[PDB]
């Protein structure tokens, strides 16, 4: 009994033009254009993001298992997610040695916390 | 925390006692609506005999739906707009009928539908679209204790009892339908019965007086 | 839909302290917390003018305290102010009283409680007087302020205007005479 | 600096009661049906009794279209007007228990299984009985047999059935 | 703190809070006060006055010292008496052993009677004295004497 994670609007919000010239970038910009149809909502343009679009607060920052995301980097950094599992999800951060993800990774099993990595190179 | 499970056993038989006087009135005010609509009958009837054509009662009570939607009025019709409350579009109100407020109605008259309802109509808004305003705030009138506590300084402990007021024309008319927050009716299910909206009642479109095709109107908007 | 008013319209109030001082924010929450609670009239005066900011909580002189005391049915009233209660030496005979204040100068402090008097806070006065039982609030003067006589300049309003100095040779010509044309 | 509760969720006390499916007035006991879906589809057959778990207990005679006795849900079917009276036929034991079922195992692959012998029987038992019934109207065991469908020139919003 | 200011706050948005039709050209009125007279005097006629023109007698080598004469109210002049011998001296003088207050040494020229002393006799000297400021004094029980 936990309310079903919807996104609203999965697509991302891509910049105006990002597609046309190189030098745009993807990421999101208000278009102040004076002319813009960004700007304007002309039917027919991007969607710009909105605080309309946010996600439902129980759901938010859930991700598909129901869980937020921790960034572990040692044991004792996993050791706050011990009793909260069905809640949280350790991501073993990337800069840690293979040797140490080991480590961690055993430590995550033995508390039974979902890491979302792992995986774990191989 | 101790003998509150007795409390509910009190106060359930106050509420067993108000349901009878809520009862009793309701039995009283059909009564009185059953005998006000024969009367009228009756006296068309008994003077039709004798040569005398009597001539019904202006109508105490009118019902303004607004029409056309805000952002082309002028100044003038849209404060007059924003007194009845009609500040969305599809909206009502029960405006008590005066000289006053039949020229409240003469200013608005093309943004405006309005007529006089009848209980039936006046029922079928405030139990559906009914709703209160509850310390300003849009509380909806779910559970007639509610309107009690509000209007219970002028009389009116049910739903049924601020229709009375509102329908009748009551000298209590003034915190009802204050109380009753706007109608909030949505497009009419039929549809207008027109092709075009604005105009009036001779003319086709949906707008002015329309004396008692607004009854008609409003249990499909409703 | 038609809006009569401006929509969104904050408060006007403020309902919080933009102060960040720890204690206070304790000393709001107490008193927030009765506010709500006594349903005392007095709590909800308290705890707006614990909101005030420095300029409208202006310092209560010892000598206006003494005033509020010699009032007809209040000399043994507790003297609520919140905002600093400051020392006075223009009057003498301080009478022995209790005074809730938020802050008292060093003077003040002394100069109540030489004459016997009390120095409170406005915690120890929420023991004392939850509902505000026999209380007798006090306000600084907000209209004797040195940017006050500024506000609202110009003809003929009668009122100050700015300069950094002085007297002659500083706005005394041309707008304040007859004999330089006119008077304002 | 918070973490959430880790207690769970106890749902709130539902107001659902779990009142009877009201069949439609078509479906009387004896009634031929055309399943519209399923292995049988098309196939006509009878309506012999309304189980427990909304469900139509079905038969067809087994030995007349092969389709056997066998649930099928109200919904996938059509009520024709014609019925074989089904004052003969036993149906009590017949119920939501008779069709235990166990999803074995979960094998997949690699490579008629059998039927049981009271289920055999308990064919025979009603299919014996309405034979009889069905032989007594004519033509009436060679409709069970053929098996429905919609011709070019059929308009199902105009059709009887 | 730059994080803070609202320039940060702008970034992206073109004209740098300073409009577009307007521009933000550099000194679009002149310079500092100028068309004072000209087209400044809508503000110069508000907000101002006495802003032209020269009123008054001239000084030249005003030495800011002839100019000195700092007030003192007699509200005020106690203070002048010290802090721990005060208590004393203001529930009993009784004449003729008065707490003698200079006004001079103490930074102050003229005496000059705003507020209201007690009954108790002061001494006070001073370089000058309001009418009344005397008066209070002499009323009080105390003398000014000058220096």
Do not use: C
Request: charged share 30%; proline share 5%.
């Amino acid at each position: 009994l936990h309310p079903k994670i919807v996104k609203k609007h999965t697509k991302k919000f891509k910049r105006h033009h990002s597609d046309r010239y190189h030098r745009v970038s993807e990421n999101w910009r208000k278009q102040k254009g004076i002319d813009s149809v960004v700007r304007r909502r002309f039917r027919g343009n991007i969607s710009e993001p909105t605080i309309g679009y946010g996600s439902n607060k129980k759901t938010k920052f859930m991700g598909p298992d129901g869980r937020k995301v921790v960034l572990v980097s040692n044991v004792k950094g996993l050791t706050p997610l011990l009793m909260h599992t069905k809640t949280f999800a350790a991501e073993i951060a990337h800069n840690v040695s293979s040797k140490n993800r080991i480590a961690i990774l055993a430590e995550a099993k033995k508390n039974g916390i979902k890491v979302t990595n792992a995986k774990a190179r191989l | 925390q101790k003998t509150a499970e007795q409390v509910a056993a009190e106060r359930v038989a106050r509420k067993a006692e108000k349901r009878a006087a809520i009862l009793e009135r309701n039995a009283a005010y059909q009564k009185e609506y059953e005998t006000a609509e024969r009367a009228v009958i009756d006296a068309k009837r008994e003077a039709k005999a004798n040569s005398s054509y009597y001539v019904s009662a202006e109508a105490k009570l009118v019902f303004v739906v607004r029409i056309k939607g805000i952002n082309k009025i002028p100044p003038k019709p849209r404060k007059v707009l924003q007194l009845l409350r009609l500040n969305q579009i599809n909206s009502g109100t029960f405006v008590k009928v005066t000289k006053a407020t039949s020229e409240l109605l003469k200013l608005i008259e093309p943004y405006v539908a309005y007529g006089y309802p009848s209980y039936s109509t006046v029922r079928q808004l405030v139990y559906k679209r009914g709703y209160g305003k509850i310390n300003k705030q849009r509380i909806p009138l779910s559970d007639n204790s509610i309107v009690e506590a509000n209007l219970g300084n002028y009389g009116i402990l049910s739903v049924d009892d601020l229709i009375h007021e509102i329908v009748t024309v009551g000298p209590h008319f003034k915190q009802a339908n204050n109380f009753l927050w706007p109608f909030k009716l949505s497009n009419p299910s039929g549809g207008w019965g027109v092709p075009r909206k604005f105009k009036h009642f001779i003319q086709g479109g949906s707008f002015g007086n329309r004396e008692e095709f607004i009854n008609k109107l409003v249990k499909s908007m409703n | 839909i038609d809006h009569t008013s401006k929509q969104h319209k904050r408060s006007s109030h403020r309902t919080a302290p933009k102060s960040d001082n720890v204690y206070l924010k304790l000393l709001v929450k107490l008193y927030a917390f009765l506010a709500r609670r006594t349903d005392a009239p007095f709590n909800k005066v308290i705890l707006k003018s614990l909101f005030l900011s420095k300029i409208n909580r202006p310092p209560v002189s010892v000598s206006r305290i003494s005033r509020a005391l010699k009032q007809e049915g209040a000399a043994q009233k507790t003297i609520v102010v919140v905002g600093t209660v400051t020392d006075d030496n223009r009057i003498f005979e301080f009478p022995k009283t209790t005074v809730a204040a938020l802050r008292f100068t060093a003077g003040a402090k002394a100069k109540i409680l030489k004459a016997g008097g009390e120095a409170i806070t406005l915690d120890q006065l929420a023991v004392r007087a939850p509902k505000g039982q026999n209380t007798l609030i006090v306000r600084g003067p907000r209209a004797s302020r040195e940017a006050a006589r500024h506000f609202g300049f110009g003809p003929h309003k009668g009122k100050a205007p700015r300069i950094q100095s002085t007297g002659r040779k500083f706005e005394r010509a041309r707008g304040r005479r007859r004999s330089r044309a006119f008077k304002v | 600096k918070w973490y959430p509760a880790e207690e769970v969720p106890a749902p709130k006390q539902t107001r659902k009661a779990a009142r009877p499916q009201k069949l439609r007035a078509s479906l009387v006991p004896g009634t031929v049906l055309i399943l519209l879906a399923g292995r049988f589809r098309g196939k006509r057959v009878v309506y012999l009794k309304h189980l427990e778990d909304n469900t139509l207990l079905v038969s067809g005679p087994f030995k007349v279209n092969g389709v056997p006795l066998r649930r099928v849900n109200a919904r996938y079917v059509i009520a024709t007007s014609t019925r074989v009276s089904l004052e003969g036929v036993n149906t009590e034991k017949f119920n939501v228990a008779y069709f235990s079922r166990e999803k074995l195992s979960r094998k997949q692959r690699a490579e008629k299984k059998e039927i049981k012998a009271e289920r055999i029987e308990d064919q025979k038992n009603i299919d014996k009985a309405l034979l009889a019934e069905i032989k007594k109207t004519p033509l009436l065991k060679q409709y069970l047999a053929a098996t429905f469908s919609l011709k070019n020139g059929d308009r199902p919003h105009l059709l009887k059935f | 703190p730059t994080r803070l200011t609202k320039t940060r706050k702008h970034r992206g948005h073109v004209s740098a809070g300073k409009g577009r039709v307007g521009k933000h050209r550099k000194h679009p009125g002149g310079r500092g006060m100028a068309g004072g007279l000209h087209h400044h005097r809508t503000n110069l006629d508000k907000y101002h006055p006495g802003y032209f023109g020269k009123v008054g007698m001239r000084y030249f080598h005003k030495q800011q010292a002839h100019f000195w004469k700092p007030v003192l109210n007699l509200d005020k002049l106690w203070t002048l008496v010290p802090e721990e011998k005060r208590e004393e001296y203001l529930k009993s003088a009784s004449k003729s052993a008065a707490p003698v207050i200079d006004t001079l040494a103490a930074g102050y020229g003229k005496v000059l009677g705003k507020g209201r002393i007690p009954d108790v006799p002061v001494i006070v000297k001073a370089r000058f004295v309001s009418k009344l400021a005397e008066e209070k004094i002499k009323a009080a029980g105390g003398v000014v004497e000058l220096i």
